[PDB]
Protein backbone atom coordinates (compact mmCIF):
# COMPACT_ATOMS: atom_id res chain seq x y z
CA UNK A 1 0.00 0.00 0.00
CA UNK A 2 1.26 3.45 -0.82
CA UNK A 3 0.12 4.62 2.58
CA UNK A 4 3.64 5.63 3.49
CA UNK A 5 3.66 7.71 0.34
CA UNK A 6 0.57 9.45 1.60
CA UNK A 7 2.49 11.20 4.34
CA UNK A 8 4.94 12.60 1.86
CA UNK A 9 1.98 13.80 -0.17
CA UNK A 10 0.80 15.72 2.84
CA UNK A 11 4.19 17.27 3.45
CA UNK A 12 4.35 18.34 -0.16
CA UNK A 13 1.03 20.08 0.01
CA UNK A 14 2.13 21.79 3.19
CA UNK A 15 5.31 23.20 1.69
CA UNK A 16 3.57 24.39 -1.47
CA UNK A 17 0.86 26.27 0.37
CA UNK A 18 3.51 27.81 2.56
CA UNK A 19 5.30 28.71 -0.65
CA UNK A 20 8.51 28.73 1.24
CA UNK A 21 11.43 27.91 -0.93
CA UNK A 22 13.14 30.74 -2.62
CA UNK A 23 13.67 28.23 -5.31
CA UNK A 24 10.85 27.47 -7.64
CA UNK A 25 13.30 24.67 -8.07
CA UNK A 26 12.14 23.42 -4.73
CA UNK A 27 8.50 23.79 -5.71
CA UNK A 28 9.15 21.98 -8.93
CA UNK A 29 10.27 19.06 -6.84
CA UNK A 30 7.11 19.29 -4.78
CA UNK A 31 5.02 19.39 -7.89
CA UNK A 32 6.76 16.34 -9.30
CA UNK A 33 6.24 14.25 -6.21
CA UNK A 34 2.59 15.19 -6.03
CA UNK A 35 2.14 14.33 -9.68
CA UNK A 36 3.46 10.84 -9.27
CA UNK A 37 1.40 10.27 -6.16
CA UNK A 38 -1.83 11.29 -7.84
CA UNK A 39 -1.03 9.11 -10.85
CA UNK A 40 0.11 6.19 -8.75
CA UNK A 41 -3.04 6.04 -6.70
CA UNK A 42 -5.24 5.38 -9.64
CA UNK A 43 -3.51 2.84 -11.74
CA UNK A 44 -5.03 3.22 -15.13
CA UNK A 45 -8.62 2.20 -14.57
CA UNK A 46 -11.60 3.60 -16.31
CA UNK A 47 -15.34 3.98 -15.57
CA UNK A 48 -15.86 0.25 -15.87
CA UNK A 49 -13.84 -0.40 -12.75
CA UNK A 50 -15.79 2.15 -10.77
CA UNK A 51 -19.08 0.67 -11.83
CA UNK A 52 -17.98 -2.79 -10.81
CA UNK A 53 -16.94 -1.57 -7.40
CA UNK A 54 -20.29 0.10 -6.85
CA UNK A 55 -22.17 -2.98 -7.76
CA UNK A 56 -20.12 -5.02 -5.23
CA UNK A 57 -20.79 -2.63 -2.58
CA UNK A 58 -24.55 -3.77 -3.69
CA UNK A 59 -25.06 -3.73 -1.60
CA UNK A 60 -22.84 -5.42 0.85
CA UNK A 61 -24.24 -8.38 -0.08
CA UNK A 62 -21.39 -9.96 1.76
CA UNK A 63 -17.98 -8.38 2.25
CA UNK A 64 -17.27 -5.78 -0.32
CA UNK A 65 -14.13 -4.08 -1.47
CA UNK A 66 -14.30 -0.34 -1.84
CA UNK A 67 -10.63 0.28 -1.22
CA UNK A 68 -9.72 2.39 -4.13
CA UNK A 69 -12.71 4.70 -3.78
CA UNK A 70 -11.89 5.20 -0.10
CA UNK A 71 -8.30 6.07 -0.92
CA UNK A 72 -9.39 8.61 -3.50
CA UNK A 73 -11.73 10.23 -0.96
CA UNK A 74 -8.98 10.62 1.59
CA UNK A 75 -6.66 12.16 -0.95
CA UNK A 76 -9.31 14.58 -2.08
CA UNK A 77 -10.05 15.76 1.50
CA UNK A 78 -6.49 16.51 2.20
CA UNK A 79 -5.99 18.12 -0.95
CA UNK A 80 -9.18 20.40 -0.40
CA UNK A 81 -7.93 22.09 2.56
CA UNK A 82 -4.67 22.74 1.71
CA UNK A 83 -6.22 23.70 -1.62
CA UNK A 84 -7.51 26.69 -1.53
CA UNK A 85 -4.31 27.92 -0.30
CA UNK A 86 -2.15 26.10 -2.54
CA UNK A 87 -4.22 26.90 -5.77
CA UNK A 88 -3.44 30.36 -5.37
CA UNK A 89 0.16 29.70 -4.97
CA UNK A 90 0.35 27.18 -7.89
CA UNK A 91 -1.27 29.37 -10.39
CA UNK A 92 0.70 32.51 -9.85
CA UNK A 93 3.70 30.80 -9.64
CA UNK A 94 2.77 29.35 -12.96
CA UNK A 95 3.32 31.97 -14.80
CA UNK A 96 6.50 32.97 -14.17
CA UNK A 97 9.04 31.28 -12.99
CA UNK A 98 9.24 29.05 -13.71
CA UNK A 99 8.61 28.40 -17.50
CA UNK A 100 10.63 25.84 -16.21
CA UNK A 101 9.26 24.51 -13.11
CA UNK A 102 6.14 24.50 -15.62
CA UNK A 103 6.58 21.70 -17.02
CA UNK A 104 6.25 20.27 -13.66
CA UNK A 105 3.38 22.40 -12.33
CA UNK A 106 1.11 22.10 -15.31
CA UNK A 107 1.40 18.38 -15.22
CA UNK A 108 0.60 18.44 -11.52
CA UNK A 109 -2.42 20.58 -12.12
CA UNK A 110 -3.72 18.15 -14.82
CA UNK A 111 -3.46 15.04 -12.68
CA UNK A 112 -4.81 16.47 -9.76
CA UNK A 113 -7.61 17.37 -12.21
CA UNK A 114 -8.93 14.40 -12.73
CA UNK A 115 -9.66 13.65 -9.28
CA UNK A 116 -10.56 16.02 -7.80
CA UNK A 117 -12.78 16.99 -10.86
CA UNK A 118 -15.17 17.19 -9.87
CA UNK B 1 -19.42 -21.64 3.23
CA UNK B 2 -21.69 -18.95 1.94
CA UNK B 3 -24.45 -19.98 4.32
CA UNK B 4 -22.07 -20.18 7.23
CA UNK B 5 -20.96 -16.60 6.94
CA UNK B 6 -24.60 -15.73 6.57
CA UNK B 7 -25.52 -17.28 9.88
CA UNK B 8 -22.57 -15.65 11.57
CA UNK B 9 -23.69 -12.27 10.36
CA UNK B 10 -27.16 -12.95 11.68
CA UNK B 11 -25.80 -14.06 15.03
CA UNK B 12 -23.75 -10.93 15.32
CA UNK B 13 -26.87 -8.91 14.52
CA UNK B 14 -28.95 -10.56 17.23
CA UNK B 15 -26.07 -9.71 19.54
CA UNK B 16 -26.56 -6.12 18.47
CA UNK B 17 -30.26 -6.16 19.17
CA UNK B 18 -29.62 -7.28 22.70
CA UNK B 19 -26.51 -5.14 23.06
CA UNK B 20 -27.96 -2.03 24.64
CA UNK B 21 -31.61 -2.33 25.46
CA UNK B 22 -29.90 -3.85 28.47
CA UNK B 23 -29.30 -7.56 28.61
CA UNK B 24 -25.59 -7.25 29.29
CA UNK B 25 -25.33 -10.81 30.45
CA UNK B 26 -27.02 -12.20 27.38
CA UNK B 27 -24.62 -10.41 25.07
CA UNK B 28 -21.58 -12.14 26.48
CA UNK B 29 -23.17 -15.52 26.13
CA UNK B 30 -23.95 -15.00 22.48
CA UNK B 31 -20.62 -13.44 21.61
CA UNK B 32 -18.85 -16.41 23.10
CA UNK B 33 -21.04 -18.73 21.06
CA UNK B 34 -19.67 -17.08 17.96
CA UNK B 35 -16.41 -18.83 18.72
CA UNK B 36 -14.62 -15.86 17.21
CA UNK B 37 -13.17 -14.31 20.38
CA UNK B 38 -11.02 -16.01 22.99
CA UNK B 39 -13.00 -16.33 26.22
CA UNK B 40 -10.85 -19.13 27.58
CA UNK B 41 -7.19 -18.84 28.38
CA UNK B 42 -4.35 -17.17 26.57
CA UNK B 43 -5.65 -19.03 23.49
CA UNK B 44 -5.88 -15.43 22.22
CA UNK B 45 -3.03 -16.32 19.90
CA UNK B 46 -4.85 -19.24 18.41
CA UNK B 47 -7.38 -16.54 17.70
CA UNK B 48 -4.54 -14.87 15.83
CA UNK B 49 -3.78 -17.94 13.82
CA UNK B 50 -7.42 -18.13 13.08
CA UNK B 51 -7.93 -14.56 12.00
CA UNK B 52 -6.05 -14.22 8.77
CA UNK B 53 -7.92 -17.32 7.65
CA UNK B 54 -11.19 -15.50 8.33
CA UNK B 55 -13.33 -14.58 5.39
CA UNK B 56 -13.19 -11.01 4.25
CA UNK B 57 -16.68 -10.29 5.48
CA UNK B 58 -16.00 -11.29 9.09
CA UNK B 59 -12.42 -10.06 9.17
CA UNK B 60 -13.95 -6.59 8.85
CA UNK B 61 -16.58 -7.05 11.61
CA UNK B 62 -14.25 -8.06 14.46
CA UNK B 63 -13.55 -4.46 15.48
CA UNK B 64 -17.02 -4.10 16.98
CA UNK B 65 -17.05 -7.61 18.34
CA UNK B 66 -14.22 -6.46 20.50
CA UNK B 67 -15.33 -3.40 22.48
CA UNK B 68 -18.82 -4.83 22.56
CA UNK B 69 -17.23 -7.40 24.78
CA UNK B 70 -15.33 -4.74 26.60
CA UNK B 71 -18.45 -2.83 27.51
CA UNK B 72 -20.85 -5.43 28.74
CA UNK B 73 -17.80 -6.74 30.49
CA UNK B 74 -17.31 -3.29 31.99
CA UNK B 75 -20.92 -2.43 32.79
CA UNK B 76 -21.79 -5.85 34.09
CA UNK B 77 -18.65 -5.79 36.17
CA UNK B 78 -19.54 -2.52 37.70
CA UNK B 79 -17.94 -2.82 41.06
CA UNK B 80 -20.74 -4.07 43.23
CA UNK B 81 -21.93 -2.81 46.55
CA UNK B 82 -21.63 -5.00 49.60
CA UNK B 83 -21.70 -14.93 49.14
CA UNK B 84 -20.15 -15.91 45.89
CA UNK B 85 -19.04 -13.21 43.52
CA UNK B 86 -16.72 -14.45 40.87
CA UNK B 87 -15.55 -11.16 39.43
CA UNK B 88 -12.46 -12.97 38.29
CA UNK B 89 -14.23 -14.29 35.27
CA UNK B 90 -15.63 -11.58 33.03
CA UNK B 91 -12.27 -10.13 33.95
CA UNK B 92 -10.08 -12.80 32.50
CA UNK B 93 -12.24 -12.42 29.44
CA UNK B 94 -11.25 -8.80 29.08
CA UNK B 95 -7.61 -9.77 29.50
CA UNK B 96 -7.64 -12.38 26.78
CA UNK B 97 -9.57 -10.01 24.59
CA UNK B 98 -7.01 -7.26 25.10
CA UNK B 99 -4.14 -9.54 24.26
CA UNK B 100 -6.12 -10.39 21.17
CA UNK B 101 -6.68 -6.73 20.32
CA UNK B 102 -3.05 -6.07 21.09
CA UNK B 103 -1.96 -8.65 18.56
CA UNK B 104 -4.13 -7.38 15.77
CA UNK B 105 -4.32 -3.63 15.89
CA UNK B 106 -2.52 -3.14 12.64
CA UNK B 107 -4.92 -5.39 10.87
CA UNK B 108 -7.71 -3.38 12.39
CA UNK B 109 -9.16 0.05 11.71
CA UNK B 110 -7.11 1.64 14.41
CA UNK B 111 -9.07 2.09 17.53
CA UNK B 112 -7.52 0.44 20.47
CA UNK B 113 -9.66 2.77 22.41
CA UNK B 114 -10.74 -0.42 24.04
CA UNK B 115 -8.37 1.00 26.58
CA UNK B 116 -10.72 3.80 27.45
CA UNK B 117 -13.54 1.43 28.15
CA UNK B 118 -11.08 -1.04 29.66
CA UNK B 119 -10.15 1.18 32.57
CA UNK B 120 -11.95 3.52 34.90
* Residues 6 or more apart in contact with residue B65 via CB below 8 angstroms: B12, B31, B34, B36, B37
Sort out which chain A residues have CB atoms less than 8 A from B57's CB and list them. Answer: 62-63
In chain B, the residue whose alpha carbon lies closest to the alpha carbon of A60 is B57
Which residue, B25, B5, B26, is CA-closest to B14?
B26
In chain A, the residue whose alpha carbon lies closest to the alpha carbon of B59 is A63
E strand or H helix at B43, and its extent? none
Contact flag A62-B59 (C-beta cutoff 8 Å):
no
Q: How far apart are CA A90 and CA A92, in angstroms?
A: 6
Q: Resolution of the experimental model in angstroms, please? A: 21.4
Helices (H), chain B: 2-18, 24-34, 46-52, 56-76, 92-103, 114-118
Residues B27 and B15: beta-carbon distance below 8 Å: yes
Residues of B at the A interface, defined by Cβ within 8 angstroms: 2, 5, 55-60
Residues A41 and A20: beta-carbon distance below 8 Å: no
Q: Within 13 A of A87's CA, how many CA atoms are on the CB side? A: 9
Which residue, B109, B89, B86, is CA-closest to B32?
B89
Amino acid sequence: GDSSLYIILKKLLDFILKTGGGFQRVRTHLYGSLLYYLQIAQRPDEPDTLEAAKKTMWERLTAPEDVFSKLQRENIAIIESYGAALMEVVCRDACDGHEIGRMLALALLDRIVSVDKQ
Amino acid sequence: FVDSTFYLLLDLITFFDEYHSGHIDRAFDIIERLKLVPLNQESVEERVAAFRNFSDEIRHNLSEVLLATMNILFTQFKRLKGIEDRDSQLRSQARTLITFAGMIPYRTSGDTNARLVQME
